[PDB]
Write a protein that binds this ligand. Structure first.
Ligand SMILES: Nc1ncnc2c1ncn2[C@@H]1O[C@H](COP(=O)(O)OP(=O)(O)OP(=O)(O)O)[C@@H](O)[C@H]1O
Ligand SMILES: Nc1ncnc2c1ncn2[C@@H]1O[C@H](COP(=O)(O)OP(=O)(O)OP(=O)(O)O)[C@@H](O)[C@H]1O
Ligand SMILES: [Mg+2]
Ligand SMILES: [Mg+2]
Lengths: 1030, 103
């Protein structure tokens, strides 16, 4: 509900107070004090999370009104205040008590508390200082305690709740941090820092634009006339009180150009805006393009002057989002609506924004003319999603007039007259956004330090026009391509265009292409591009033309296809190349952007007509940290959920723990992650919504749901060859268990640059070729290190993915190493190299009908290995007799690394016990050492086969115990029947609780469980590891 | 279809046999070159996914879609690659008790 909002200078922790009507109607006597919730009229689409409030009766307050302590929000009497709120009483009175709170305090009072000998002295002094009362005090994280001096950091479990001094654990913090000086409430500032002056000519000061529109009910002075925000402008009372007006009735503006007329309004305290500017709708900033930033004027121009235009011409500004044929009906309709709905003020040489809903094709609604209002209700079931400019000429005003620069249009009198083109520069996004104001599906945004190649493309386009045209012309063409196929490369253009104010045309010739049959539809494609562009390219001042998916059109030439079709390809290639230059003849300053998903398929016959190309890689850690910040920022996460309850993350999120551990190689579409989380978080919210113990009144994301989401995203893509980073537990890189473990870390610690920022260009990498423990271990070993000192395990799966097809399979090697390197930091596991089994040309593959894997692997990954960065090998060879030793040598991939199998003296017996753990051994004695009754040289993975046999023996014991219980089940059932029901309906715990007490690991071991290997083959490995494996 | 869908508010679409509209031919051999990744049907599928994705990002309440088919993998590559699909189910040969109720 809405209630009248008012303020007091009372302390932040004092109770609010409510008008007698609210107190009598909603003061439930089951509670000593009425709890409630507040929200304010925040600007824009979002909303603040509803803040709990505590209140008391006051019969003096006007009907349906609230007083709140100004310092709760940080308001001050130095500026005009708000007047109404969203409120609710907390029905059912239940409110959570916080598990803990953290406080941060200046050094003086911090030390004065920390040196106190007892807890209650600290508590009571805090109570005195801040008027905090146990149980009753409402608190939120980031709440102020005193500006300059102390603040409330965080709360648990919820970010808001009640404090109990006996059970809310109190955490007290100081660090002398200068951030205390940044505590300034919402205001604390002496305005006389601009000293008073008796008169001024124009008060020229910076003009800027809002991040959003302003809802009409916010318009505090509320002029009675129905009139348009498009004429309104908004700023503080500061500077306004330096004029001789408030809520100014008449303002006019010019900045070394034409004049605009505007109306002024005051912005209120809750904003986070600049301390000094005027904020305007973009309708202003369509004038003064990218400049003209500072000058205004105010005078009594008139209350109802300029009331007509006898004739005008109004114009399409033109643009691909405008000039295409099928949108015309709705744009013209909403255009006439813009003039029909009210009188409005216009200037000569002036721009009106108009927006519409796409996909309104075929649907015409307002078939009946006039009648009762309907357009506005559709206009609130609509919400706009594409935006275009219309331009109006000067009015042909009758007779002589001193006013010759501005005019009013209204539904009566003169009609709209359309005219062909009026070319105009699109606004640069850094001067003012537009999408944000209209809340459209938003062009992503960059900071130019972290992404290189956006800066590259920017530097191309920014120079080729504006900075060039002072001199001789220069066209440009660029091709964009990427190894990975979802990299967002099209979105790059959507960005850079708006960033540089480049007028964009974009072409969906991927499929919107008529008959388009490559092998038949002869030339229609070329007509489709040419005749389309020709109708819209002329009289666009800059121009970039962007084609999606050139692989739809261009293709290679091969023996496999009809020469007739090949000559069709030839014709299309040639005419495309000619039209590409023809734009450079007919339409000066045109620039061309191509995009291709696989660079090889465009023949060099076209590729020669590049001016540049860019490899766009998959992003890396610093980029991913930026990109998650985007998706989890408030306004983009919210705007599409129409549900009134807002959504947010909470700042305990670890963007760094996402950035790598959670993100690996993942091929963008992090969107999929954030949406998967948003669903799951919403589910638990609607779960508790079933009148459960509390309702935190906001959807709150949590790290656990991000972890679940990312792990799901690695397996829902079930075809994916990859693997997660953490297949390892209890085995976290125990570098002290043996010397060899003490040396695996060398190959990772060094390229982690901890010894130096290595040159990436001298010493060959100490990649490891692991004999290790030859019999068993290797399956674990690489995974164990990979999780605990590295970051992924995407691995070559070495036996698979050799393509049989003629001359193809080099593609799979080049792809696998590309996909490996595409994750910056982590190894590839390689099985036995017998997965490749390179074997020098004889007694096998014989190097003839197959060479394609090894003939690549000898080279390209060794090139990377010699630059010695990012990616590392950890192969697990056992049978070098099967291999050619063209690798496995000091010249390429050295460090033939051996460990052997421990003879009998092992801590690994203790670690065997430690991993039979997680399941109970009832004995007090550990009884492990009797396993050493095994004859020596035995210590293989069969340790855990023996734990399996012991567990199965416990299972057999409990199985025969339940069989005995079944046999006597007549003791509690009329028959020894229904066993499959009985165990479930009795279920007296006893849930397979483990019985390792029977020590049956020896009872297995004494059988000489022959899956162990102990033969001379082990001696063979043990000797040859030294004799040849070194 | 999309035009009607946006009109009727919260709405749902199904396609009883998606294989006919958007099944990639299983032979993987419509052309030997890379453009086998964009035969005519897959071209339709991409157009559809683009339209839907664009309207969906405006307001997720408005349209969902159900695809019924033969084998969850065998529909189409692009359908998974773009993360258009997600939450999923399958029917299984009914158990004896339900089998009795059916009979
Ligand atoms: N790094 C990113 N930054 C911003 N938006 C991104 C990013 N990665 C993906 N997206 C979003 O995903 C979509 C990417 O579409 P786009 O056409 O640019 O590429 P794609 O479809 O993955 O590739 P292709 O052009 O090869 O078909 C857009 O909606 C874009 O906003
Ligand atoms: N040194 C060890 N300490 C403890 N457990 C070990 C050890 N070596 C092997 N194991 C057991 O065996 C697993 C790792 O070795 P495993 O028997 O799986 O290798 P493998 O299959 O012979 O290896 P490869 O990949 O070379 O074929 C571990 O998960 C553990 O159960
Ligand atoms: Mg794309
Ligand atoms: Mg193994």
């Amino acid at each position: 509900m809405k209630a009248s909002l008012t303020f007091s200078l009372s302390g932040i922790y004092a109770p609010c107070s409510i008008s007698r009507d609210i107190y009598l109607e909603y003061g439930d006597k089951k509670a000593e004090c009425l709890y409630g919730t507040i929200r304010l009229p925040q600007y824009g689409p979002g909303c603040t999370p509803g803040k709990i409030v505590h209140c008391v009766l006051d019969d003096s307050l006007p009907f349906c009104s609230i007083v709140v302590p100004s310092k709760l929000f940080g308001f001050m009497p130095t500026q005009p205040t708000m007047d109404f709120c969203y409120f609710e009483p907390i029905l059912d009175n239940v409110v959570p008590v916080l598990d803990s709170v953290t406080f941060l305090i200046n050094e003086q009072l911090y030390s004065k508390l920390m040196d106190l000998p007892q807890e209650m002295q600290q508590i009571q002094f805090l109570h005195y200082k801040y008027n905090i009362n146990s149980m009753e005090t409402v608190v939120h994280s980031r709440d102020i305690l005193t500006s300059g001096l102390c603040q409330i950091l965080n709360c648990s479990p919820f970010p808001q709740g009640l404090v109990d001094f006996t059970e809310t654990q109190l955490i007290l913090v100081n660090d002398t941090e200068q951030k205390l000086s940044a505590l300034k409430y919402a205001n604390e500032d002496e305005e006389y820092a601009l000293p008073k002056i008796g008169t001024n000519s124009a008060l020229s000061i910076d003009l800027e634009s809002l991040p959003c529109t302003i809802s009409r009910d916010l318009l505090r002075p509320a002029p009675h006339i129905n009139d348009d925000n498009s004429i309104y402008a908004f700023t503080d009372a500061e500077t306004l009180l330096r004029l001789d007006v408030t809520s100014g009735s008449f303002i006019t503006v010019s900045n070394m150009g034409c004049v605009r007329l505007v109306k002024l309004f005051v912005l209120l305290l809750p904003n986070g805006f600049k301390k000094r500017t005027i904020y305007a709708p973009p309708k202003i900033i369509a004038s003064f393009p990218d400049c003209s930033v500072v000058t205004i004027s105010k005078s009594n121009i008139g209350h109802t002057d300029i009331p007509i235009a006898n004739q005008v011409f109004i114009s399409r500004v033109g643009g691909w989002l405008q000039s295409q044929k099928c949108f015309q009906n709705i744009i013209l309709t909403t255009l006439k609506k813009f003039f029909s709905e009210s009188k409005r003020i216009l200037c000569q040489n002036d721009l009106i924004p108009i927006a519409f809903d796409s996909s309104m094709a075929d649907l015409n609604i307002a078939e009946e003319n006039d009648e009762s209002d309907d357009e506005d209700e559709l206009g609130q079931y609509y919400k706009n999603d594409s935006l275009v400019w219309f331009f109006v000429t000067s009015a042909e005003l009758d007779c002589f007039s001193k006013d010759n620069s501005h005019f009013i249009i209204d539904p009566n009198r003169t009609k709209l007259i359309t005219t062909n083109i009026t070319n105009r520069r699109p606004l640069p996004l850094s001067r003012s956004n537009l999408q944000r104001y209209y809340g459209f599906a938003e062009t992503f945004y960059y900071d130019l330090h972290i992404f290189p190649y956006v800066r590259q493309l920017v530097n191309i386009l920014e120079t080729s026009f504006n900075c060039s045209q002072r001199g001789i012309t220069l066209n440009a063409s660029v091709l964009l391509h990427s190894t990975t196929n979802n990299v967002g490369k099209a979105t790059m253009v959507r960005f850079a265009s708006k960033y540089l104010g480049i007028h964009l045309l974009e072409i969906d010739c991927l499929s919107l292409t008529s008959n388009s049959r490559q092998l038949d539809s002869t030339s229609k494609i070329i007509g489709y591009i040419r005749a389309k562009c020709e109708n819209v390219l002329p009289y666009a001042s800059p121009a970039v033309i962007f084609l999606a998916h050139l692989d739809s059109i261009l293709l290679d030439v091969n023996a496999n296809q009809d020469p007739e079709a090949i000559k069709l390809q030839k014709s299309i290639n040639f005419e495309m190349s000619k039209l590409l230059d023809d734009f450079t003849f007919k339409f000066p300053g045109t620039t061309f952007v191509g995009s291709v998903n696989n660079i090889d398929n465009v023949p060099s016959s076209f590729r020669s007509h590049m001016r540049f190309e860019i490899l766009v890689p998959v992003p890396s850690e610093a980029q991913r940290l930026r990109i998650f910040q985007w998706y989890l920022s408030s306004h983009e996460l919210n705007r599409d959920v129409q549900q009134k309850v807002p959504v947010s993350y909470m700042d305990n999120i670890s963007f760094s723990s996402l950035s790598s551990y959670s993100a690996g190689l993942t091929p963008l579409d992090i969107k999929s992650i954030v949406e998967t989380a948003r669903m799951t978080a919403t589910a638990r919210f609607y779960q508790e919504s079933k009148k459960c113990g509390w309702l935190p009144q906001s959807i709150l994301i949590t790290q656990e749901d991000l972890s679940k989401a990312t792990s799901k995203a690695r397996n829902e893509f079930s075809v994916s060859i990859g693997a997660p980073q953490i297949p390892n537990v209890t085995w976290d890189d125990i570098g002290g268990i043996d010397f060899v473990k003490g040396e695996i870390l060398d190959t990772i610690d060094m390229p982690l640059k901890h010894p130096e920022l290595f040159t990436s260009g001298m010493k060959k990498r100490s990649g490891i070729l692991f004999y290790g423990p030859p019999g068993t271990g290797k399956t674990l070993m690489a995974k164990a290190i990979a999780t605990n000192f590295s970051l992924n395990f995407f691995s070559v799966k070495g036996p698979e993915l050799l393509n049989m097809y003629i001359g193809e399979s080099e593609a799979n090697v080049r792809r696998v190493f590309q996909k490996a390197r595409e994750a910056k930091p982590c190894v590839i596991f390689f099985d036995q190299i017998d997965s490749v089994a390179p074997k020098r040309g004889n007694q096998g593959d014989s190097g003839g009908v197959m060479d394609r894997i090894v003939s690549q692997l000898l080279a390209e990954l060794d090139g990377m290995s010699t630059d010695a960065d990012g990616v590392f090998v950890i192969g697990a060879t056992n049978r070098p007799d099967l291999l050619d030793e063209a690798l496995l040598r000091p010249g390429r991939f050295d460090k033939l690394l051996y460990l052997g199998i421990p003879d009998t003296d092992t801590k690994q017996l203790n670690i065997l016990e430690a991993l039979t753990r997680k399941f109970v051994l009832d004995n007090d004695v550990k009884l492990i050492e009797l396993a050493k009754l095994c004859p020596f040289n035995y210590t293989g993975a069969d340790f855990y086969a023996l734990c399996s046999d012991a567990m199965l023996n416990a299972m057999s014991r409990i199985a025969r115990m339940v069989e005995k219980k079944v046999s006597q089940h007549n003791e509690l059932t009329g028959e020894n029947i229904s066993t499959r029901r009985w165990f479930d309906k009795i279920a007296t715990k006893e849930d397979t609780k483990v019985v390792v007490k029977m020590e049956d690991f020896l009872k297995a071991q004494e059988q000489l469980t022959p899956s162990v290997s102990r033969a001379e083959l082990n001696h063979y490995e043990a000797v040859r590891a030294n004799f040849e494996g070194a | 279809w999309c035009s009607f869908c946006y009109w009727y508010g919260p709405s749902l679409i199904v396609l009883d046999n998606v294989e006919a509209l958007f099944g990639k031919p299983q032979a993987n051999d419509g052309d030997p070159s890379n453009n086998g990744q964009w035969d005519n049907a897959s071209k339709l599928l991409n157009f559809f996914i683009n339209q839907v994705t664009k309207i969906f990002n405006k307001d997720n309440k408005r349209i969902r879609v159900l695809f019924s088919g033969k084998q969850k993998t065998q529909i189409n590559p692009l359908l998974f690659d773009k993360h258009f699909v997600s939450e999923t189910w399958s029917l299984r040969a009914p158990d004896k008790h339900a089998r009795a109720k059916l009979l």
